[PDB]
Amino acid sequence: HWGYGKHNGPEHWHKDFPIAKGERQSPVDIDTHTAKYDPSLKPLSVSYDQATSLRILNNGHAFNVEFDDSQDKAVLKGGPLDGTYRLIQFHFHWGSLDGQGSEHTVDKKKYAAELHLVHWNTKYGDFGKAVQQPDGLAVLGIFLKVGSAKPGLQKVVDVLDSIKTKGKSADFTNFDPRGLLPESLDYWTYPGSLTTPPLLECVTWIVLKEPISVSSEQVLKFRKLNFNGEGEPEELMVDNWRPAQPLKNRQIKASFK
Ligand SMILES: Cc1ccc(S(N)(=O)=O)cc1
Numbered sequence: 001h002w003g004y005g006k007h008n009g010p011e012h013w014h015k016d017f018p019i020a021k022g023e024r025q026s027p028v029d030i031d032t033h034t035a036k037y038d039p040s041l042k043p044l045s046v047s048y049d050q051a052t053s054l055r056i057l058n059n060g061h062a063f064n065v066e067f068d069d070s071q072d073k074a075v076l077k078g079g080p081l082d083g084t085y086r087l088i089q090f091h092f093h094w095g096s097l098d099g100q101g102s103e104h105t106v107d108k109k110k111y112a113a114e115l116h117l118v119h120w121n122t123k124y125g126d127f128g129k130a131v132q133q134p135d136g137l138a139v140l141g142i143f144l145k146v147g148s149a150k151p152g153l154q155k156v157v158d159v160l161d162s163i164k165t166k167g168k169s170a171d172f173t174n175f176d177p178r179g180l181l182p183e184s185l186d187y188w189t190y191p192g193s194l195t196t197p198p199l200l201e202c203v204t205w206i207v208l209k210e211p212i213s214v215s216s217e218q219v220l221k222f223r224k225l226n227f228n229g230e231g232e233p234e235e236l237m238v239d240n241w242r243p244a245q246p247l248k249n250r251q252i253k254a255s256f257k
């Protein structure tokens with residue numbers, strides 16, 4: 001029953017998910033002048049050439065593009081990561097207006113949206129076991145600004161009409177997530193959590209410095225989705241972001257000098 005409304009949003013989550021007030025919650029503000037270059041970080045490896053997308057689902061909070069994670073088809077390695085992390089899904093968070101929508105902020109700047117590519121550590125066997133571990137997940141976060149269209153996003157945009165309401169899904173095979181990346185893999189990294197309930201503190205966050213540009217028309221179509229199910233009163237799926245949480249005893253490291 002959690003959501004993003006006045007009566008069930010981020011301010012209420014702690015009552016059913018007390019870890020909401022925990023010591024490594026996400027997202028956070030990335031203060032670029034406090035983040036430190038870390039020479040111990042290994043090169044980041046995004047290996048998505050064999051990615052197998054399956055389906056797109058409106059889950060009432062966002063939409064997920066789901067992948068076959070039964071083998072090492074699309075993986076993330078290197079950077080701050082030990083071992084191999086398998087891509088399971090991606091989704092976005094976005095705003096009602098271009099001036100908000102991202103979860104992470106950069107020197108307090110909010111972007112129009114934020115893409116999360118979610119991966120689990122293969123040493124734990126399955127996603128469910130991974131979310132019982134402090135190094136169970138790695139999420140690659142990418143900011144979206146409004147400007148020129150992102151060609152690699154259009155296939156996602158075009159299928160949204162078919163998953164307007166909560167619980168709807170559609171086939172989404174043969175989608176290449178490499179088309180959602182910026183040119184540079186420069187990043188910031190820190191230990192955090194899922195940004196939605198259950199808010200589990202299992203995530204190594206890797207947030208790219210370079211945003212991708214998407215067109216106004218593309219993000220406008222995100223905003224036509226519904227939080228509600230079919231036949232119910234329309235509630236536009238907008239502002240499905242959690243604001244920045246206390247950094248507490250954490251360091252944000254930069255991959256770049
Ligand atoms: C969509 C896409 C863009 C760029 C490449 S690359 N790294 O082989 O030039 C592959 C796929």
Ligand SMILES: Cc1ccc(S(N)(=O)=O)cc1
Nearest residue numbers: 116118139193194195196
């Ligand atoms: C199940 C789940 C997976 C990933 C996230 S996120 N927004 O932290 O990437 C939240 C919930």
Ligand SMILES: [Zn+2]
Nearest residue numbers: 091093116195
């Ligand atoms: Zn997310």
